[PDB]
PDB file of C-alpha atoms in Angstrom:
ATOM      1  CA  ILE A   1     131.724  68.905  34.435  1.00 62.11           C
ATOM      2  CA  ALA A   2     129.778  72.421  35.324  1.00 62.67           C
ATOM      3  CA  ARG A   3     126.863  70.860  34.195  1.00 60.41           C
ATOM      4  CA  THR A   4     126.847  67.876  36.412  1.00 60.75           C
ATOM      5  CA  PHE A   5     128.216  67.794  38.630  1.00 61.24           C
ATOM      6  CA  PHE A   6     128.616  71.262  40.129  1.00 63.78           C
ATOM      7  CA  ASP A   7     126.560  73.736  41.757  1.00 65.14           C
ATOM      8  CA  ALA A   8     126.818  77.348  40.111  1.00 66.03           C
ATOM      9  CA  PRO A   9     129.193  80.384  41.422  1.00 63.68           C
ATOM     10  CA  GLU A  10     125.448  82.506  42.122  1.00 64.75           C
ATOM     11  CA  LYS A  11     123.791  79.485  43.844  1.00 64.96           C
ATOM     12  CA  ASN A  12     126.923  78.906  47.034  1.00 65.73           C
ATOM     13  CA  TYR A  13     127.196  82.901  46.521  1.00 65.05           C
ATOM     14  CA  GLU A  14     123.218  83.016  47.432  1.00 60.97           C
ATOM     15  CA  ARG A  15     123.859  79.644  49.448  1.00 61.99           C
ATOM     16  CA  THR A  16     126.731  81.478  52.442  1.00 61.35           C
ATOM     17  CA  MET A  17     125.155  85.063  51.907  1.00 63.63           C
ATOM     18  CA  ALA A  18     121.849  83.624  53.982  1.00 65.45           C
ATOM     19  CA  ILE A  19     124.413  81.122  56.056  1.00 63.42           C
ATOM     20  CA  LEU A  20     125.814  84.844  57.689  1.00 64.03           C
ATOM     21  CA  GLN A  21     122.799  85.868  57.980  1.00 63.95           C
ATOM     22  CA  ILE A  22     121.156  82.497  60.032  1.00 64.04           C
ATOM     23  CA  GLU A  23     124.706  82.643  61.987  1.00 64.63           C
ATOM     24  CA  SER A  24     124.686  86.647  62.348  1.00 65.04           C
ATOM     25  CA  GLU A  25     121.576  86.414  63.923  1.00 63.00           C
ATOM     26  CA  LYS A  26     122.519  83.795  66.381  1.00 62.64           C
ATOM     27  CA  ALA A  27     125.136  85.461  67.793  1.00 61.56           C
ATOM     28  CA  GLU A  28     123.769  88.915  68.512  1.00 63.24           C
ATOM     29  CA  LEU A  29     120.226  86.229  70.215  1.00 62.20           C
ATOM     30  CA  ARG A  30     123.626  84.632  72.177  1.00 63.04           C
ATOM     31  CA  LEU A  31     124.775  87.840  73.005  1.00 62.18           C
ATOM     32  CA  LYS A  32     121.970  89.615  74.512  1.00 65.94           C
ATOM     33  CA  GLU A  33     120.528  86.658  76.354  1.00 66.98           C
ATOM     34  CA  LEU A  34     123.937  87.288  78.199  1.00 64.71           C
ATOM     35  CA  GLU A  35     123.588  90.607  79.249  1.00 65.99           C
ATOM     36  CA  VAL A  36     119.506  89.593  79.620  1.00 62.08           C
ATOM     37  CA  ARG A  37     120.770  86.909  82.056  1.00 60.58           C
ATOM     38  CA  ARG A  38     123.558  88.900  83.927  1.00 60.71           C
ATOM     39  CA  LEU A  39     120.967  92.049  84.562  1.00 59.52           C
ATOM     40  CA  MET A  40     118.410  89.497  85.628  1.00 60.34           C
ATOM     41  CA  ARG A  41     121.191  88.052  88.328  1.00 60.09           C
ATOM     42  CA  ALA A  42     122.877  91.704  89.206  1.00 57.99           C
ATOM     43  CA  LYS A  43     118.449  92.892  90.031  1.00 60.66           C
ATOM     44  CA  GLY A  44     115.994  90.389  90.237  1.00 63.34           C
ATOM     45  CA  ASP A  45     113.281  92.499  88.680  1.00 64.61           C
ATOM     46  CA  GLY A  46     112.657  90.040  85.753  1.00 65.27           C
ATOM     47  CA  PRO A  47     111.063  86.243  85.400  1.00 62.91           C
ATOM     48  CA  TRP A  48     114.793  84.134  86.337  1.00 66.64           C
ATOM     49  CA  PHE A  49     116.208  84.571  89.476  1.00 65.69           C
ATOM     50  CA  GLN A  50     112.731  84.451  91.386  1.00 64.63           C
ATOM     51  CA  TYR A  51     113.949  82.172  94.327  1.00 64.39           C
ATOM     52  CA  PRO A  52     111.091  81.413  96.556  1.00 67.59           C
ATOM     53  CA  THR A  53     109.945  83.688  99.707  1.00 67.81           C
ATOM     54  CA  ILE A  54     107.155  82.563 102.616  1.00 68.02           C
ATOM     55  CA  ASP A  55     103.086  82.631 100.291  1.00 65.32           C
ATOM     56  CA  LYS A  56     100.895  85.346 102.394  1.00 64.60           C
ATOM     57  CA  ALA A  57      98.106  82.473 101.907  1.00 61.48           C
ATOM     58  CA  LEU A  58     100.046  80.801 105.525  1.00 61.69           C
ATOM     59  CA  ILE A  59      98.862  83.989 107.489  1.00 62.93           C
ATOM     60  CA  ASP A  60      96.365  83.602 109.574  1.00 64.76           C
ATOM     61  CA  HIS A  61      93.177  86.627 110.199  1.00 65.57           C
ATOM     62  CA  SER A  62      90.781  85.459 112.764  1.00 62.81           C
ATOM     63  CA  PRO A  63      91.215  87.310 115.981  1.00 61.22           C
ATOM     64  CA  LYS A  64      93.441  85.897 118.476  1.00 60.52           C
ATOM     65  CA  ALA A  65      93.718  84.611 122.348  1.00 59.20           C
ATOM     66  CA  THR A  66      95.220  88.490 123.447  1.00 58.35           C
ATOM     67  CA  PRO A  67      94.340  92.092 121.177  1.00 58.32           C
ATOM     68  CA  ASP A  68      98.062  92.690 120.443  1.00 61.35           C
ATOM     69  CA  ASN A  69      99.067  90.827 118.324  1.00 65.70           C
TER      70      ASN A  69
ATOM     71  CA  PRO B   1     114.329 105.791 115.421  1.00 64.67           C
ATOM     72  CA  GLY B   2     111.616 107.109 116.944  1.00 63.91           C
ATOM     73  CA  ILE B   3     109.817 108.166 120.517  1.00 64.83           C
ATOM     74  CA  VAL B   4     107.376 105.925 122.235  1.00 66.07           C
ATOM     75  CA  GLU B   5     104.199 108.591 123.554  1.00 64.13           C
ATOM     76  CA  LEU B   6     103.722 107.282 126.586  1.00 65.04           C
ATOM     77  CA  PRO B   7     100.338 108.519 129.187  1.00 67.34           C
ATOM     78  CA  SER B   8     101.187 110.828 131.918  1.00 63.60           C
ATOM     79  CA  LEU B   9     100.182 110.024 135.221  1.00 62.36           C
ATOM     80  CA  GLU B  10      97.605 112.055 135.907  1.00 60.54           C
ATOM     81  CA  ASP B  11      95.621 109.858 132.010  1.00 60.51           C
ATOM     82  CA  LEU B  12      95.712 106.938 134.663  1.00 59.97           C
ATOM     83  CA  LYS B  13      94.277 107.236 137.694  1.00 57.80           C
ATOM     84  CA  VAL B  14      90.453 106.083 137.936  1.00 60.53           C
ATOM     85  CA  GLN B  15      88.694 104.438 141.217  1.00 57.53           C
ATOM     86  CA  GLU B  16      89.679 101.555 141.469  1.00 53.88           C
ATOM     87  CA  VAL B  17      87.403  98.288 141.987  1.00 49.66           C
ATOM     88  CA  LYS B  18      88.997  97.046 145.145  1.00 51.88           C
ATOM     89  CA  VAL B  19      87.157  93.535 145.852  1.00 53.46           C
ATOM     90  CA  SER B  20      89.026  90.087 145.912  1.00 53.37           C
ATOM     91  CA  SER B  21      88.577  87.600 143.626  1.00 56.74           C
ATOM     92  CA  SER B  22      86.746  85.500 145.280  1.00 58.04           C
ATOM     93  CA  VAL B  23      83.815  88.908 145.259  1.00 58.44           C
ATOM     94  CA  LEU B  24      84.159  89.233 141.609  1.00 55.87           C
ATOM     95  CA  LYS B  25      83.635  85.595 140.408  1.00 54.41           C
ATOM     96  CA  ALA B  26      80.560  85.471 142.771  1.00 54.01           C
ATOM     97  CA  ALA B  27      78.404  88.276 141.094  1.00 55.35           C
ATOM     98  CA  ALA B  28      80.559  87.134 137.448  1.00 55.53           C
ATOM     99  CA  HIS B  29      77.229  86.563 135.757  1.00 54.86           C
ATOM    100  CA  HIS B  30      75.464  89.197 136.829  1.00 56.91           C
ATOM    101  CA  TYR B  31      78.367  91.713 136.025  1.00 54.70           C
ATOM    102  CA  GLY B  32      78.157  90.409 132.731  1.00 52.75           C
ATOM    103  CA  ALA B  33      74.669  90.497 131.749  1.00 53.61           C
ATOM    104  CA  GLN B  34      74.139  93.825 133.909  1.00 54.29           C
ATOM    105  CA  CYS B  35      78.034  95.719 132.243  1.00 54.62           C
ATOM    106  CA  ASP B  36      77.374  94.293 128.410  1.00 55.01           C
ATOM    107  CA  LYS B  37      78.200  97.200 126.914  1.00 55.22           C
ATOM    108  CA  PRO B  38      80.684  99.100 128.688  1.00 52.42           C
ATOM    109  CA  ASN B  39      83.024  95.866 128.252  1.00 51.81           C
ATOM    110  CA  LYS B  40      81.806  94.469 125.232  1.00 53.70           C
ATOM    111  CA  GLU B  41      82.150  98.538 123.367  1.00 50.82           C
ATOM    112  CA  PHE B  42      85.110  98.441 125.402  1.00 46.88           C
ATOM    113  CA  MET B  43      86.225  94.796 124.815  1.00 46.41           C
ATOM    114  CA  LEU B  44      86.020  95.705 120.504  1.00 47.71           C
ATOM    115  CA  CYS B  45      87.991  99.416 121.087  1.00 49.97           C
ATOM    116  CA  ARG B  46      91.453  96.232 122.263  1.00 49.32           C
ATOM    117  CA  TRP B  47      90.093  94.336 119.379  1.00 52.12           C
ATOM    118  CA  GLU B  48      90.461  97.176 116.592  1.00 52.69           C
ATOM    119  CA  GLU B  49      92.927  99.450 118.053  1.00 52.60           C
ATOM    120  CA  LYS B  50      95.575  97.321 118.932  1.00 51.33           C
ATOM    121  CA  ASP B  51      97.127  99.291 121.982  1.00 49.10           C
ATOM    122  CA  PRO B  52      95.516 100.595 125.064  1.00 46.18           C
ATOM    123  CA  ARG B  53      96.520 104.055 124.618  1.00 45.02           C
ATOM    124  CA  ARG B  54      94.020 104.556 122.283  1.00 46.35           C
ATOM    125  CA  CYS B  55      91.626 102.684 124.228  1.00 42.74           C
ATOM    126  CA  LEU B  56      91.897 104.197 128.312  1.00 45.45           C
ATOM    127  CA  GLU B  57      89.356 106.399 127.992  1.00 46.80           C
TER     128      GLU B  57
END
């Protein structure tokens, strides 16, 4: 029965170790994602939460009719 | 905020050109042809400085 149907204890042991490593890395990544999202919401210096402003390519720099502008 | 820098009344005193509009319009073309250099210098100074107080002289 052990030779035909059952997995070895060593195989299960190392499979469990691999599973634990993968989910531990995923959990640390999730916590870092939450911290990064909170920081970029708070400060707004990063690539996320960049709400649009007015583009400066629409300004006319030619001389106008009145010098005071 | 700041205090506005304003020239005194002695800096604004000059002998005026006391003629009417039709007098100026009669001789407008010759005035543009003959008095071109100070007029163009004043207008360039006005358009570059963007400030009357810096162009008074």
